[PDB]
Nucleic acid binder design. Structure first.
Ligand SMILES: O=C(NC1(C(=O)O)CCCC1)c1ccc(-c2ccc(NC(=O)c3nc(-c4ccccc4)oc3C(F)(F)F)cc2)cc1
Ligand SMILES: O=C(NC1(C(=O)O)CCCC1)c1ccc(-c2ccc(NC(=O)c3nc(-c4ccccc4)oc3C(F)(F)F)cc2)cc1
Ligand SMILES: O=C(NC1(C(=O)O)CCCC1)c1ccc(-c2ccc(NC(=O)c3nc(-c4ccccc4)oc3C(F)(F)F)cc2)cc1
Lengths: 585, 593, 593
RNA sequence: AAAAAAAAAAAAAAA
């Protein structure tokens, strides 16, 4: 809709029945005209933000990864007050801004074509905010829209939404007041594939009032309820994607990429063919070696031997042969899993690594615990203080104080490396937040337990799924310190490997798609797998959920099976945790 | 004067008649003897500071620019107080220190010979400060003197001064009490050329009491008054330069530089000759397109073809080819302007770009505005709060609190680039301060309007003179929020192109300097021009002023014409702004009372 | 002892007679199993910490030094409370953490084989702390143990201990309450060589109550008392080293280094041989030049000549020839000192450089002073304020407030360099701490002098031992401000060069080892010397001491002589600076009352 | 981390 000369606008409607209806408006052609693409987004003519996308002129090939940057700028005048810091100006980004950056980055990063090396930056500035609303999902939609309008090698629009479960109804774009009446809150992002919605990213939690609401007659959030919520999110995502596509079509764009960006593939076809022909049997034999150290040294000497010949023939190109060896090893591992259902460490597909839990490991600490799963080792420590030591928060969001604080540390020596020790990175902030929200729903009220609580997790050894280990360790340490939890909580990380491998028959035209679900995946299995998701909760319902995928469709039965498998593992871990301690000390 | 063996001293006198006399003393040969040059500067026996200059042993020829760095270190013991921070120690530099660094850097940077690639650093430490005095101009003088004594490829001494207009007299080096009785105060820096003072840098503002003083019978600071003030600062600059030169002569130095520094020109002469002979006609034709996208595409194609062919011929030397192409383009643009009075975008020499102004653009904002000039686009937002949210200042200078705050932001996408988004840089601080001082003299008193005020400017699009756009946007947004200003304010930027071109005749000896003044310059005209002169004010008098120039002298009539043209442009912009809003609105329901 | 499958532990006992006995326990095989080495250390089953050591897979040859890194992580839950900062989380390291990092780094860094280029990182995390205990020395032991256990090219275990002098007994690992009754406190680190303890690192101070304790009848800490304290620490170090070695043997390791680390020597044998054969006599004569400027000019001429001669022959290698020339020049200077007792500047073995002291240099400062020793030049400034301006400290240690603060600044221009100016480095923190502790024992009580005191030292020129110069300047400036000190304090830096050379005779296999002690060493002498130590105090006893060495044994007579020589120099300097001021002045009118 | 050796329009990961 051309409201003005050069200005275009589109609208999408979210109908929540008796809970109301909301409108989202996208506008382009008026602000920030020197960027590659720019969009202004409105929610209910009271929430307003701007998103701009640009790209660098020259490729940059000293890097070996795709350089993408996302930034969120929260302006205090959007809340109508002056910043409280000593210099009266906005400083480093807050935790909410970092979490929003991660939410945008996770689904968009894999949507670009492989091998790109130009810098790409997305900046989202918050301009106006209603006190009872949340801006993160709106920001996701705006970032997608500006990237789409920028004429870059980007795979279609991406839509994001939040759904909350209130009195048996899934409500889209709920307010803070409505969230206070819900039992479960979930952010979902996806895209449209051949007329159907494919889920890409999920982040969900249980609310802080869930136990009381369930005692009043509400339905608890079990696995089937979560699946139903995922199904209910799809129509909203479809509507948002349609609005973005209409905006792109109206303001030209569509085709005519004009500027063409080069691509830098990891390796050439001939190098890969030679590497396969020379090392297929060596790698196949090596992967059958039980143990860790001997297998690692066998693989290392295979690498040094193979690179000693092909590099000389291919005129001093060792990175290409290394990449080809990585690709061949990954393919072999996937094929072995798909055919024999045999994992690299020898486990079955439903097996968990060796578990152990212990309490009272730091002499003067108020509470402490040590939790081990395979080579993953987490130490948790809890301290208690007067209620005045709760954190005071000054930001755009509605939160003003923080009674329970959780901090997560990941030192380089946990993986045998060296590196800078200093401020936490974005990934540490994200992992800490996930564990914190996993624990929030099981906590006594201020009236019955008037203390400020700080929990610290330190990853002393890491081989995959450190967040779930921190969840378990925090439950153990809180019990050891005498906090009266409503119920213990545990978590697990699951993986999925899918492929269209041949089935019983011939002709090679009867291939059917197959899926395999893996319990308690290692780091390598995450790197080589097709989907990974983490589940935490009690023995009655889920408290936290996180999922990332890139497949173009997942049958419902596969997801139901995966959720049930995760629940079984969670119960098995809860039994071992209870053996160490089963009531507050 | 050798007061002690190896120690030399020189003095300069500033005579203000019935307002008093002041003395400035330079000393060398006693402190910091391992630096390349070092000087101690005194003002009235009570203000004392130290300046030191050093240079790196080896060059960095892979750099594309001259790496000069300036640092100002404020010590709290200069005021007899312990720092108030949690660790009781000086931390990151304050806004005053950053502004002083910019003041030193602007005139000194062009004074070095081009092509230099050694690192040069200047550090100024404040040792003792009288509560009623300012140290910035003294610092400019000391930095110049230490660099002059360091035996570097530096062009002559530079002198800097402050002048304030009190009862029709321009007083040099005024105190805080004297400044609060003035209507205008201005900092000027220059050098001596063929026995006359050439002005290089200017920074001026009207005071916060100007309206009340003018109502009481004082003369308002119009254009002619400001020009007279510029003329009155020259004798002081000459005296300061003479004192510095005498100090340099006394302590040896002067000749025999001893250390020789290499130079790295951007391109060779043969490369320039080839580029010219291959591309002159193509470039001349391309500049006639005058339609941006087509012109940009044509220039890019010409550049690609030339670099390809000349890299084939010269075996992979592309940087010099690019530099030569840029220099040739600059020469053609300047010649077109000087001969035919044609600009890049097809404007006359006095024309302003298309203007537009709008208010109430952010829904839950106390006031907001959008201001556009051709391709520069500024968004301004106002917020109001209780008087206790005023900024508390704990610096070395006399200021203790700030009722009105202005912050300026310049994101990378404003010009289509990618870069880091973080803490503001020094240039952002400078632009913000310039826009802030243009509005102070018009704000209402705290008794009438008891609120703290914060203004934010965001440069959504940048193609030249973003600070003047910030001034206009702040006026609009403040009016939209219900602040009762005394008068609206607006601003503009001006440019210059000059050279020695033979007048109609012969003998090649009648060559004389010729000047052309441009209104509302583009970014490219600033890059290829000879100066950048920003003027802001009301319809009655000027409120803020900033100038930097690289030439060796501008005739007074040229500046007078520039000021008059700027005033005409300002009036046009004010009329356009008033058409959009001409009186304060009602206060927003979301604001406090 | 294998308490559990794969878990080993060992114990060391420390017996203080009637003052009690303590135990230190080392454990491995349980925590942090992916690091190269990891150890847990316990003190009295109430203090607990963890240390981990890792190494990078590949070397890096573009560095010209050994990249070792040490980090100390203080966790606030070890004290059982939530951090007090706005974000409720631990931020940048505190001063105590930095000092502990340097205490670990000083003895361990020279203990690795030269030429190593892999990254080595050590991280020590504090897990549990008793309120009346100190964790720094326990951390030193743990870092040594984890490095030893990692199978790296590391020369044997290193032990560290603290001894405090109480009622004539040297107590090991004292508590805070016990230190409150001591006159002297000393941290010592060493290692076992051919069955005897060789001292490597010392850092010592006098307590804040020393004057009153000595008035009460205790013995003052003179030079002989400090020597006795150094002797009393050896058995504890031996026991700690033995426990570490037993732990290493029990858990395998010992042999089988497995991982081989390449080494990158500075120069080859042939390059050194040619450089010597072509430059021996040419450099020998240049060192006889008494003029520093002529000396360095000739030296750089010779370097350029040798470089341009030998670059062609060795296919171009400037770094190797430069390194060989450095080794040759250092060897020649050492031989000259050992044989003729001559120094670079022609001084005698006990001579001090020219001294000068002056007060009242900054006009408005409460007190100020300028101190010069040869080419070293320090400016000191004092500030006084209300007692509420004392620093408030929030950390693990028992300290909670800081009445006297000392800050030390080392700008790049003090050596004629360019560099970043801003937050201080670790070395500045260390030097400031040393000067602060040197002054603490001479200070009036709060009841007698109710003020907060801030002292700032600025190194305007540096050529060697700026920290002792800071001590002298602080005494002068404090007297000038009117602070009633109990006695003045001065300091000096000393060097020692040792070697085994032939004695008058024949056979050439009867060489004997000799030592030469140097007073007030230059920077070059420190670079080319074998040991350096700094001593400060009054005319009656020592207040601070710092020592670093790598020799495998020092006779007691040599050390006694060195201490006496330092005392003589200190008395001479005190006499010189009493001429400038001998009693406190009247308080400045600008200071509060 | 060891050591004396800013000017201009031009973050992802176990690694
Ligand atoms: O700990 C973690 N924690 C995190 C968590 O989730 O919380 C913390 C925050 C996020 C992660 C983590 C730990 C380890 C990994 C990992 C991934 C891949 C490989 N890669 C191989 O391991 C390999 N490389 C080869 C090969 C190499 C060269 C030539 C030929 C082959 O072969 C192989 C072979 F199959 F043998 F196993 C190792 C480790 C990831 C995550
Ligand atoms: O806003 C601005 N600054 C600030 C302000 O507020 O003021 C904002 C924040 C602080 C200050 C600003 C914006 C843009 C510019 C700019 C300048 C020059 C060019 N350069 C060409 O534009 C060009 N380059 C060529 C050429 C190049 C190589 C080879 C051959 C030809 O030709 C040409 C041709 F003349 F055509 F136009 C572009 C943009 C400057 C300032
Ligand atoms: O100021 C200081 N302050 C500090 C303090 O302690 O507080 C502050 C914090 C720690 C230090 C300091 C000042 C100077 C040094 C230093 C060290 C070595 C050399 N090096 C030569 O000095 C030399 N180099 C040559 C030569 C070179 C190349 C080719 C051939 C010859 O010859 C020679 C010859 F020995 F003769 F004198 C110079 C200065 C150290 C510290």
């Amino acid at each position: 809709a051309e409201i003005d000369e050069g200005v275009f606008e589109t609208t999408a409607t979210i109908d929540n029945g008796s809970f109301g209806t909301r409108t989202i408006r996208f506008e382009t052609g008026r602000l920030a005209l020197q960027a590659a693409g720019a969009v202004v987004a409105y929610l209910d003519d009271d929430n307003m933000l701007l998103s701009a996308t640009t790209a660098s002129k020259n490729p940059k090939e000293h890097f070996d990864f795709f350089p993408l940057t996302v930034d969120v700028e929260e302006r205090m005048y959007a809340a109508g007050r002056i910043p409280g810091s000593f210099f009266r100006r906005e400083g480093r980004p807050s935790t909410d801004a970092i979490l929003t950056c991660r939410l945008i980055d996770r689904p968009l990063r894999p949507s670009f074509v492989d091998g790109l090396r130009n810098e790409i930056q997305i900046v989202v500035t918050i301009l106006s905010l209603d006190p009872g609303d949340l801006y993160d999902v709106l920001a996701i939609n705006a970032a997608s829209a500006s990237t789409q309008l920028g004429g870059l090698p980007f795979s279609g629009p991406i839509g994001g939404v939040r759904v909350a479960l209130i009195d048996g109804t899934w409500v889209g774009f709920p307010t803070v007041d409505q969230i206070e009446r819900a039992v479960f809150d979930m952010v979902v992002a996806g895209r449209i594939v051949e007329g159907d919605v494919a889920i890409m990213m999920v982040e969900a939690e249980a609310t802080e009032n869930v136990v009381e609401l369930v005692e009043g007659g509400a339905q608890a959030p079990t696995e089937s309820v979560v699946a139903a919520g995922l199904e209910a999110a799809k129509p909203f995502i479809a509507a948002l994607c349609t609005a973005q596509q209409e905006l792109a079509d109206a303001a030209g764009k569509s085709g005519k990429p004009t500027v063409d960006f080069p691509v830098f593939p990891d390796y050439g076809e001939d190098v890969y063919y030679s590497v396969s022909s020379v090392a297929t049997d060596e790698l196949a034999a090596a992967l059958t070696i039980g143990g860790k150290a001997e297998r690692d040294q066998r693989i290392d000497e295979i690498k040094t031997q193979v690179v000693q010949r092909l590099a000389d023939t291919y005129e001093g190109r060792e990175k290409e042969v290394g990449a080809a060896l990585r690709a061949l090893t990954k393919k072999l591992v996937r094929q072995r899993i798909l055919t024999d259902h045999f994992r690299i460490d020898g486990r079955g597909i439903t097996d968990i690594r060796a578990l152990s839990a212990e309490v009272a490991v730091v002499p003067r600490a108020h509470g402490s615990a040590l939790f081990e799963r395979g080579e993953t080792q987490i130490l948790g420590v809890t301290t208690l203080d007067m209620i005045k030591m709760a954190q005071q928060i000054d930001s755009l969001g509605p939160e003003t104080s923080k009674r329970y604080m959780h901090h997560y540390n990941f030192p380089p020596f946990s993986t045998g490396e060296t590196g800078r020790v200093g401020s936490p990175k974005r990934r540490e902030i994200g992992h800490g937040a996930l564990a914190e929200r996993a624990l929030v729903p099981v906590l006594p009220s201020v009236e019955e337990f008037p203390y400020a609580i700080r929990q610290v997790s330190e990853a002393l050894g890491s081989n995959g799924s450190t967040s779930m280990g921190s969840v378990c360790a925090s439950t153990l340490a809180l019990l050891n310190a005498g906090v009266p939890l409503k119920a213990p909580v545990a978590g697990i990380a699951m993986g999925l490997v899918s492929d269209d491998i041949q089935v019983e028959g011939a002709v090679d035209g009867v291939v059917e798609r197959r899926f395999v679900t893996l319990t308690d995946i290692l780091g390598a299995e995450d790197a080589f797998g097709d989907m990974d998701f983490k589940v935490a909760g009690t023995k009655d319902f889920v408290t936290a959920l996180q999922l990332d995928t890139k497949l173009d469709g997942i049958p419902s039965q596969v997801l139901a099976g995966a959720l049930e498998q995760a629940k079984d593992a969670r119960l098995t871990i809860l039994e071992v945790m209870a053996e160490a301690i089963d009531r507050p000390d």
